[PDB]
Amino acid sequence: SGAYDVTWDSVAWKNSAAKPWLGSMPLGNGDLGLNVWVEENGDLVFLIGKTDAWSENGELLKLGRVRLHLAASPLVAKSFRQVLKPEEGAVEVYSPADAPRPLYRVWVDANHPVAHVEVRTASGKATGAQADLELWRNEPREVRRVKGRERDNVEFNDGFRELRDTPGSLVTVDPDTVLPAKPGGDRIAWCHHNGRSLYPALLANQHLESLLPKYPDPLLNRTFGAVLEGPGFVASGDRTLKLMKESAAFRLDLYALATTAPDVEAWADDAGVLADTLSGLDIEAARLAHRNWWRAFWGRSWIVVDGNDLPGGDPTDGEMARAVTQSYAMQRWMTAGSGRSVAAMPIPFNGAIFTVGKETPKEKYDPAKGDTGNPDFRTGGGNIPFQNTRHIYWPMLASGDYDLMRPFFRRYRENLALLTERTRLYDKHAGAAFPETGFFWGLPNDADFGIGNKEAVLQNLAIRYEIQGGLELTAMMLDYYDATQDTDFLVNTLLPLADGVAAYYDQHWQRGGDGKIVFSPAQSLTTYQSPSGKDVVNPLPDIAGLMAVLPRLIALPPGTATAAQRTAWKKTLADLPPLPRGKTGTGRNNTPDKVPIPSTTQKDDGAPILLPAQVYGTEKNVENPEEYAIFPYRLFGVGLPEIDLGLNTFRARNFTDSTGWAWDGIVAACLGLSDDAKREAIRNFAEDRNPDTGHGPNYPGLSAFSREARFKWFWKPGPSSGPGNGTEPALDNGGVGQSILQSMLLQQRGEKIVLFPAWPKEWNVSFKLHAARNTTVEGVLKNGKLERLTVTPPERRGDVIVREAQ
């Protein structure tokens, strides 16, 4: 216990004086989250996040900010300690640092939509106290892109990316409402009510007006907010609580609620009932159940790495091992904090609900410039891009974090009916296609679709034909089902989605003369595009996905998949073109011995490799799509045939970025390349100081730690996410990091479990990870030797293959 705690020994740090909100700690219960900090004056401040606080603009909003100010500063000169305790699910502040009980104890109940702030003066001497609601959305705020200055409004272009093509080039951020507080009461309350919605105009632009009566508006009249109260407080204003009598021990309770409401009073009635109900619960019983929830969560799985004690080693290896261990845990803490949405909202890759900021003063605000510092901002806006989001969820399987995965699958399942009707209308065949990115309700945004597009093919070439996510989602769900053996999940979530995706892939294209499907028009992820409709033929990601997924669907238990489904899937499988293969040639910048960047530059003497497609043009991004057959689809890798094909492909890759969504490290682990994998894990989760980087001086991809935040695991986006400083935490970075470390330890080969496929011997490790058939593997490697291995259930031990650390 304490193994993952984060301890700070001072209120002061690099940005405390001018930007204390950059020194927050995150904490959540899966739906409600806080970013909490202590300012140099001793105030406790926190921003409030919620997974489903979607505004009229589709913007994910903070619920607000709260400031607690004791009448007498509670800090002392002697010492100070602020600690994140993940196994108790809490943040605690001690002053002095050795005080027996914390000055501030902050937690979000694992089991209820309430957060608690408990205060205890160290002297036991009573104090007055005031809590202020700090809302910044008090009047409508204009964000405008002006004709001569398109690049100036980063808030417009990046924070409202999905709306960038709105006619008129104006986004208005509607304000919030503070409810009148009851005179003499101990409660204040506030919320945001969506009085309008972008959804009807979007359906009309996308030729889907006919679906408007069938699927209700997902934004209109959505109302979300919170109630703040505390025993012994009185509302001295609608935005202010104060202690009536000085106290040495007191508490604030924050209850959060989202619903659909005709007005804020209706919302407030339901939220007051929620507060009444939950305030009646015994807080110590709630605290015990909260702590037990977190103890069990951390007992599901772990990876604890350290340097071994063999003479001749390098102490930096131990330093890196420990840093990697802490980072892996902090990623898990943030995903759990945001990963049990009450409304099937996937974890936002661009900051989850743990973004921070501080609004610029109204008097300084310029609508033509916007405000990227404001608390609601996130680079990339609110749409959910699969290429980033998949990396958050893949590692949850080996962690055993099935509950964190269900909202992602549920999101797609709830969108399936609309997207099936859309496909029926657009394409006049069965099935459903899921765009690479779009709004949470499943449709692409109008910028990617095209304002006034007379057709139904997406205008944006980056994602015009990219629908591979549906296949990859199906593969992830198949792993979930194999692990949990949850038949209800199989029948009610996996199968309808798999049915739609597989039917689309069977019906949207035509068989050619050889009887095999010709995948054109098509593209290979976002890197090889098809402006002509003919530039890309037979992309490897999609073909590899069908090769990996269709046999598994065909083999599902009797009475789940239908015999008719099996017949259709078998025919699709039998009609697949081959996985794209070829030889090395000249790649990007005419470099030799590479994956040929124009498909036509293969050299007859080149090494045999996988290709990103059978036919493809020049690159428009920096993905290595040919590697999809290694990860996620496990067609090649250590312990599988044609390992040299996989290795040649990896060595010949054109793109070698690290951190963010870059997934080279995962592929290296899948190929048994322990050194490559270790290096990438160290870049994502630590700092790579090793001299020969294959990268320029001061390459940003040598470390993913935050540039400016005190909680350094608020990852920064990787260089391949583009030029700017993005939004932190970039959870795709930490998701990739988890996949790398897990894949170094454990990989599945159908029913078999391969341990230590790419593990460096200099690292001792104690781990517990999950696998298919409700199996856990708990192992301890010391000085390169497996000292202990416990497999549950025991009969599954016979399916474990133990490889040697390298």
Burial of 570 (0-12, 13-18, 19+ CB in 10 A): middle
Cα distance between residue 562 and residue 502, in whole Å? 14
* Encoded tokens for 33: 């989250």
Cα distance between residue 377 and residue 372, in whole Å? 6
* Encoded tokens for 208: 């889907």
Cα angle: 702, vertex 708, 714; to 5 degrees = 70
Q: How far apart are the first and last CA of the chain?
A: 30
**Which residues, listed in sequence order, are joined to residue 189 by a DSSP beta bridge?**
227
Is 63:254 a contact under the CB 8 Å cutoff?
no
Is 160:248 a contact under the CB 8 Å cutoff?
no
Cα distance between residue 437 and residue 525, in whole Å? 12
Cα distance between residue 429 and residue 420, in whole Å? 9
Cα distance between residue 113 and residue 274, in whole Å? 9
Resolution attained, angstroms: 2.0
* Encoded tokens for 799: 């399916």
520 backbone dihedrals φ, ψ, rounded to 5°? -165, 130
* Encoded tokens for 57: 């603009």
Cα distance between residue 81 and residue 105, in whole Å? 12
CA distances (Å), 6 to each of 87, 93, 591, 618, in order? 11, 12, 46, 46
Cα distance between residue 439 and residue 416, in whole Å? 13
Q: Which of 464, 653, 589, 618 is nearest to 527 (CA)?
A: 618
The 3-class SS string of 86-117 reads HHHCEEEEECCCCCCCCCEEEEECCCCCEEEE
> Which residue, chain included where needed, has tokens 């309430």?
114
556: helix, strand or coil: coil
Question: Pairing between strand 800-802 and 752-755?
Answer: parallel
Q: Which of 260, 467, 400 is nearest to 343 (CA)?
A: 260
Cα-to-chain-centroid distance, residue 245? 44
Cα distance between residue 690 and residue 323, in whole Å? 15
* Encoded tokens for 254: 């924050």
Is 481:491 a contact under the CB 8 Å cutoff?
no
Cα angle: 341, vertex 344, 348; to 5 degrees = 70
Cβ burial 625-661 (10 Å sphere, 16+ → b, else e): bbbbbbbbbbbbbbbbebeebbbbbbbbbbbebbbbb
* Encoded tokens for 15: 């940005």
Cα torsion for 450, 451, 456, 458, to the nearest 10°? 10
> Which residue, chain included where needed, has tokens 């216990």?
1
Q: List the 90-94 sheet strands across, edge first.
A: 6-8, 81-85, 90-94, 104-108, 114-120, 249-260, 222-229, 187-193, 177-178
Burial of 700 (0-12, 13-18, 19+ CB in 10 A): middle
Burial of 17 (0-12, 13-18, 19+ CB in 10 A): exposed
Q: What is the chain's Cα-based Rg?
A: 27
Residue 194 CB coordination number (10 Å): 22
Cα angle: 437, vertex 342, 31; to 5 degrees = 90
Q: Report the run of H or E that residue 269 belongs to, with start and end.
A: helix 264-279
Residue 21: half-sphere exposure toward Cβ, Cα within 13 Å: 17
412 backbone dihedrals φ, ψ, rounded to 5°? -60, -40
Method by which the coordinates were obtained: X-ray
* Encoded tokens for 463: 């994602």
Domains and CATH numbers, the chain: 6-136+175-299 (2.70.98.50)
Cα angle: 507, vertex 511, 515; to 5 degrees = 135
**Which residues, listed in sequence order, are joined to residue 754 by a DSSP beta bridge?**
747, 801
DSSP secondary structure of 334-395: HHHHHS--TT-PPPPTBTTT-----PPPGGG--TTT--TTSTT--TTTT---HHHHHHHHTT
Is 759:781 a contact under the CB 8 Å cutoff?
yes
Identity at 13, one-letter amino acid code: W
Identity at 53, one-letter amino acid code: A
329 backbone dihedrals φ, ψ, rounded to 5°? -65, -40
Q: Which of 239, 235, 227 is nearest to 276 (CA)?
A: 227
Q: List the 25-28 sheet strands across, edge first.
A: 25-28, 32-38, 44-50, 64-70, 129-134, 240-243, 233-237
Cα angle: 725, vertex 729, 731; to 5 degrees = 115
> Which residue, chain included where needed, has tokens 């913007």?
59
> Which residue, chain included where needed, has tokens 């033509």?
368
